[PDB]
Amino acid sequence: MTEIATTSGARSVGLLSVGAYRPERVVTNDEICQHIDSSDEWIYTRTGIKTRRFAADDESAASMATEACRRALSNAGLSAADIDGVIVTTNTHFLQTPPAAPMVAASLGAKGILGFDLSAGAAGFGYALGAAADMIRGGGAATMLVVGTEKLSPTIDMYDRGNCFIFADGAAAVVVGETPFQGIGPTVAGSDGEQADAIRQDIDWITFAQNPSGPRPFVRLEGPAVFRWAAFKMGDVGRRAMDAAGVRPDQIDVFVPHQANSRINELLVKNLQLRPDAVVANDIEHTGNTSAASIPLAMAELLTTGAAKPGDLALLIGYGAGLSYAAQVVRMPK
Amino acid sequence: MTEIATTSGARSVGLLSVGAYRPERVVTNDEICQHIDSSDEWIYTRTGIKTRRFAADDESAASMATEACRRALSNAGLSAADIDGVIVTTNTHFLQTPPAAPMVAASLGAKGILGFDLSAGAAGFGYALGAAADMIRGGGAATMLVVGTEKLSPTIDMYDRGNCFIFADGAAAVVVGETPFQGIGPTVAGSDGEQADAIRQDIDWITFAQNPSGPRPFVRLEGPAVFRWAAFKMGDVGRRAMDAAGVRPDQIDVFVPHQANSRINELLVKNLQLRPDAVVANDIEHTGNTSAASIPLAMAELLTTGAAKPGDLALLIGYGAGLSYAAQVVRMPK
Ligand SMILES: [Cl-]
Ligand SMILES: [Cl-]
Ligand SMILES: [Cl-]
Ligand SMILES: [Cl-]
């Protein structure tokens, strides 16, 4: 008889670049406060958000992903031909099928490359990044695109005084490939499925399709439940990720938690025992909560301002719907 | 520069078991023929389908996935405590969020384990299995559940003369873990995003939500286009998968293509130059096309009839929406 072959690729993998796409339209707190009894002062104090970007009607999660990938490729000095696969992570691709990944690949001029869509709420980026790293190390690919993208705005109920000022749109991609030294730490992930209702679409699409003249679905957020969970549990997740990467808290240069709420993230900083001079992502102020796109958007922001430098040691922690979390230590890209 | 650590897992990974859930309700060709001009004879001759199963109204992709996982765990002699992660592959989770994986995990009594949803049409199982193997070999997990699940019945237009008799419901799960010998070969995958319309939801959920007085969304299949692509291209994909696994066509005991159409799979059998006595999955006769669930359901069927034996060398080829494909050689589970 015979034995199935065992193969592998390059074990040392890193981020070669990040590229970001932020839709043109700025929406201020004042504009949001047209339909709720609140204020700019209240929203900012409670969430850290001042403005956010909304995509145009002719844009989609897929279209924004493609643009982010184009920019990541340019920032890496690479072309579509250099990519072996693409993982699209999103929760706002509004078709059951086909998946966005093949269309994104085709738009980039690499229609034939492997790829799929990964959905895990905000934790989607960490899972997709870990999955790309795993695939590359295993020899299934040499270089990959991982893109987080969300068009959340069409799912927002603008009268919902719990979340209409939270969610927003955008996309950001990383090129993942072989590096001289290890650039992506082990994935630390998990969930709490018992709190699946905390971030949800309230009416499923089929129930809706069978009663379309009735209420339509919107995203709902049980804010305090998520706040409590994230603020209390993500510190341990961070410690596990640093432990797995073999780094001490005081070695982290840059902290990039999912941009859910500034107060949650501030509490995490105070729990994580980072250096006083550690750089902390605050992209939320002008980006809001872009779920799956949040972390790569925040990474791009930090590099843009120069607050983060290429090579900086970064701790990434994604947390959100499903109650799903995913974290890893990485070295900052270009 | 601070160095980043790397974990390592098992070298030899395989399918420990499969578990299958087939919904109670049997739907005959004639019962489908009620809103179209066709016959049982025609459907069977053209597609290889005699009956299919429909899930009840109180069932979902997620609920079926859970039951399939329960059975897979039983068939492996394992409990939920033995599982480190779960990947749900589906294209019919009818909520943008939360993802199904955490709720499946919670239902099984392992609310905390890592997991995510992966969408790639019919190729989803191959991608998820590949990702599970990659994660385990990478040391991110030791044992995983990979479950393909589909509730397509509510997306069927009974007046669609091209596909109303094609799609169906069901779920099947595999336990993936360390094995004495190599059980999962290298992943071979790719797509054709230029043919993204071939299998699609015709109207996106948001456009639909904004126009309730218009048509509702249904799944559409450009049958001939998919037939052509699969019949002409999947042979090469199979040969690539066998080559990567270091096995010859004449060493394959079992061929498990996606159950899209019996005549496509018959053509593939001939093209692949397999042994005269090689066994070809034909679960489609009483299952129809269950997209992501199709391959593991077919595997379970072959094991049920005894056509496949545990340990048998099997070629898997998933082909479907997005135009996505994923293939690998595996050893059959229990
Ligand atoms: Cl604290
Ligand atoms: Cl989220
Ligand atoms: Cl069969
Ligand atoms: Cl499909």
From Swiss-Prot, chains A, B:
Catalyzes the condensation reaction of fatty acid synthesis by the addition to an acyl acceptor of two carbons from malonyl-ACP. Catalyzes the first condensation reaction which initiates fatty acid synthesis and may therefore play a role in governing the total rate of fatty acid production. Possesses both acetoacetyl-ACP synthase and acetyl transacylase activities. Its substrate specificity determines the biosynthesis of branched-chain and/or straight-chain of fatty acids. One of its GO terms (biological process) is fatty acid biosynthetic process. It comes from Mycobacterium tuberculosis (strain CDC 1551 / Oshkosh). The last Arg residue of the ACP-binding site is essential for the weak association between ACP/AcpP and FabH. It is found in: Cytoplasm. It catalyses: malonyl-[ACP] + dodecanoyl-CoA + H(+) = 3-oxotetradecanoyl-[ACP] + CO2 + CoA. Its EC number is 2.3.1.301. Pathway: Lipid metabolism; fatty acid biosynthesis; Lipid metabolism; mycolic acid biosynthesis. Residues 259-263 are annotated as: ACP-binding. GO terms for molecular function: 3-oxoacyl-[acyl-carrier-protein] synthase activity; beta-ketoacyl-acyl-carrier-protein synthase III activity. The active site is at A122, H258, N289. This is Mycobacterial beta-ketoacyl-[acyl-carrier-protein] synthase III. Homodimer. It holds the Pfam family ACP_syn_III_C. Belongs to the thiolase-like superfamily. FabH family.
